Ligand binder design. Structure first.
Ligand SMILES: Nc1ncnc2c1ncn2[C@@H]1O[C@H](COP(=O)(O)OP(=O)(O)OP(=O)(O)O)[C@@H](O)[C@H]1O
Ligand SMILES: Nc1ncnc2c1ncn2[C@@H]1O[C@H](COP(=O)(O)OP(=O)(O)OP(=O)(O)O)[C@@H](O)[C@H]1O
Lengths: 16, 534, 124
């Protein structure tokens, strides 16, 4: 079984 | 009143969607129109949702905006796609609740006798998708869906809101939202019919007729006849293209653009522009379902002998029997003959002469390099599609090429044979009729496999046998003069011949390449050398 | 503009959004002749082109070429001529006294067509 490929990511910003 | 006083059906310019609009009015607006006393007596609740869907360019947005215009109430709120997402946490729900805050306030202030509020969501699938089946990068989408579900139907009851949602892929929407109380009425918009295609064409041409800018030779009914499978958007595009073609004839560009302005005040649109546009500019996005009979019949049919008429009459009789019978919903027939006899063209003609709603032809030309499973899947799909219509006719040609037969060993594919043998005896659903026409060139091989008994009848397609038929065929084609015809007759009339029409055409074309003083001789040799056959 | 028209969403191609669909393909002999004439106007105007160069012969010969390839052929031909007045043995030096009277001949075009530029289509 071929291991799952790499993935991107999504980011969320927070305000102080 | 709740309805604009000047509103009427005719003013919204909608096309052939009579039934759908009537169903909407019945199932969505019946309750609000009756006096409060009786509706209170029943004590029934009111609808709050609608979900339009269908293929692109059918009128969903037009219908939604026309419904908005029809109703007299607050200006509808529009959510233009995924404009509600924000990077800061918790602000998407802020907007999704700001939308409904005003309606909540009004209902609180006035109670049951308050006005109505309408909210329109466009590209709903962008926002609302299954909570479980989603990206794990952020839980923002799930929180949004939960907020919407809570607001639309939560512990607090709100009953003066109507929400309209339009999409193109209804499957992706979450199941929890498409339940009674949120969106129970769900319509499907589809391609129009001939009457709808006439009404649509009428709605746009109106102004040109009003101002006398359309030539009298234009027949709208004919245009509606030709334009098959088109949609409203494509019809409007065709009209625009014809207009542009008509307009282009008063400008001299390509060095510097100018306009006449004195010969340009007598403009008119003829039927030629429509014909030109229908072949060059606009092609139907939905692939034409009509078969390309020109490809299969590339040189027409010529009556060189009785057998042609006999075969056509037999085909007509079979068509009549399958059309006017109830004890035998399924019928089959096989056409057999020597190679180069024209079986495919005759089968195509027989199929065309009938006027069945559904007609399709399955050929190996498309199945190049396919495995023995892909062919089975394709045949299954074709037959499944055929099953839907009330009357169906299907043609299977070149059977031996469909089984991958080779006389060495021999070899063939068993799975396809079994699938065909099962599909030749499966009756369609109740109250439907199907006809199957098969073509082949080797009857003994089929006899060996014991499938010749699966068919109901057989028809024989002979090839030219006597010199008189050859002379008649030459006369019909008219490729030689009287002197050459006499010269050829002087020899051929003595004996018999055995040749197929396709090979005859090839021989004629090969012969016509020589100089005039030799062509006839070149012909005779080709007939003598290749003509050695029973 | 795209190179893979069949990967685009269908909803974007219906009339009213993107109607005019156009295909740009390889030119024919007349198009090749026109293109070749376009890219050689300045040299002819300034008398930098030799009198033995025949455009029609090149147009007939250059088969399966595209516009970029024709421009590249002209550019290589131009450099083969400029290189005859430079000395890159030890120190890069230019003549500057024979640079004037620079001319482009048919031999340069022929040489550039056999060792520098090769089409990427069909048999050759
Ligand atoms: N039934 C119709 N009657 C009259 N005009 C129509 C009809 N259907 C389409 N048209 C014309 O085609 C245009 C396209 O229709 P519309 O914008 O409503 O499509 P849509 O289904 O909402 O689009 P999509 O699914 O591509 O987002 C309409 O504005 C109108 O110009
Ligand atoms: N009277 C005719 N009957 C049949 N075909 C005809 C007739 N007159 C002309 N033709 C043309 O003869 C051509 C030969 O027909 P077709 O290719 O269908 O033959 P076929 O017997 O199925 O061939 P094959 O042996 O190669 O499988 C077709 O283009 C058909 O249009």
């Amino acid at each position: 079984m071929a291991e799952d490929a790499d993935m991107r990511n999504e980011l969320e910003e927070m305000q102080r | 009143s709740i309805i604009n006083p000047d509103w009427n059906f005719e003013k919204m310019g909608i096309g052939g969607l009579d039934k759908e609009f009537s169903d909407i009015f019945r199932r969505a607006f019946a309750s609000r129109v009756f006096p409060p006393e009786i509706v209170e007596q029943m004590g029934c609740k009111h609808v709050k949702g609608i979900l339009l869907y269908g293929p692109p360019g059918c009128g969903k947005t037009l219908l939604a905006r026309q419904i908005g215009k029809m109703l007299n109430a607050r200006e509808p709120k529009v959510v233009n796609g995924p404009e509600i997402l924000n990077k800061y946490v918790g602000e998407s729900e802020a907007n999704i609740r700001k939308l409904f805050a005003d309606a909540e306030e009004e209902q609180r202030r006035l109670g049951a006798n308050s006005g109505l509020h309408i909210i329109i969501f466009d590209e709903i699938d962008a926002i609302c998708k299954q909570r479980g089946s989603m990206a794990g990068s952020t839980g923002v989408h799930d929180t949004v869906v939960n907020q919407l579900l809570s607001k639309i139907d939560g512990v607090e009851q709100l009953n003066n809101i109507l929400v309209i949602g339009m999409t193109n892929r209804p499957d992706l929407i979450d199941e929890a939202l498409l339940r009674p109380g949120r969106l129970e009425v769900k319509m499907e918009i589809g391609l129009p019919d001939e009457k709808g295609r006439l009404q649509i064409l009428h709605i746009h041409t109106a102004r040109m007729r009003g101002h006398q800018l359309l030539s009298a030779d234009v027949d709208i009914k004919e245009l509606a006849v030709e334009t098959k499978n088109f949609s409203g958007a494509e019809l409007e595009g065709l009209v625009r293209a014809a207009q542009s073609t008509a307009m282009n004839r008063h400008i001299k560009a390509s060095t510097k653009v100018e306009v006449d302005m004195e010969k340009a005040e007598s403009l008119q649109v003829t039927r030629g522009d429509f014909l030109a546009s229908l072949e060059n500019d606009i092609k139907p996005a939905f692939g034409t379902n009509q078969e390309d009979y020109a490809s299969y019949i590339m040189n027409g049919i010529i009556k060189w002998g009785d057998p042609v008429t006999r075969v056509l009459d037999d085909g007509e009789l079979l068509v009549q029997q399958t059309k006017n019978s109830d004890r035998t919903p399924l019928v089959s027939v096989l056409l057999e003959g020597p190679p180069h006899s024209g079986k495919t063209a005759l089968a195509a003609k027989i199929a065309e002469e009938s006027n069945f709603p559904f007609i399709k032809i399955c050929s190996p030309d498309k199945m190049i390099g396919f495995s023995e499973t892909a062919k089975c899947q394709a045949m299954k799909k074709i037959f499944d599609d055929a099953y839907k219509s009330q009357l169906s006719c299907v043609v299977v040609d070149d059977i031996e090429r469909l089984l991958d037969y080779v006389p060495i060993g021999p070899r063939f594919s068993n799975l396809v044979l079994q699938a065909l043998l099962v599909l030749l005896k499966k009756a369609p659903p109740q109250g439907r009729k199907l006809l199957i026409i098969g073509t082949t060139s080797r009857k003994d091989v089929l006899q060996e496999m014991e499938m010749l008994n699966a068919f109901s009848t057989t028809i024989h397609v002979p090839n030219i046998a006597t010199g008189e038929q050859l002379l008649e065929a030459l006369e019909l084609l008219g490729n030689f003069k009287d002197k050459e015809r006499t010269t050829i007759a002087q020899q051929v009339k003595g004996k018999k011949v055995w040749i197929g029409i396709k090979k005859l055409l090839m021989l004629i074309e090969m012969s016509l390449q020589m100089d005039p003083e030799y062509r006839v001789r070149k012909f005779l040799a080709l007939l003598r050398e290749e003509g050695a056959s029973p």
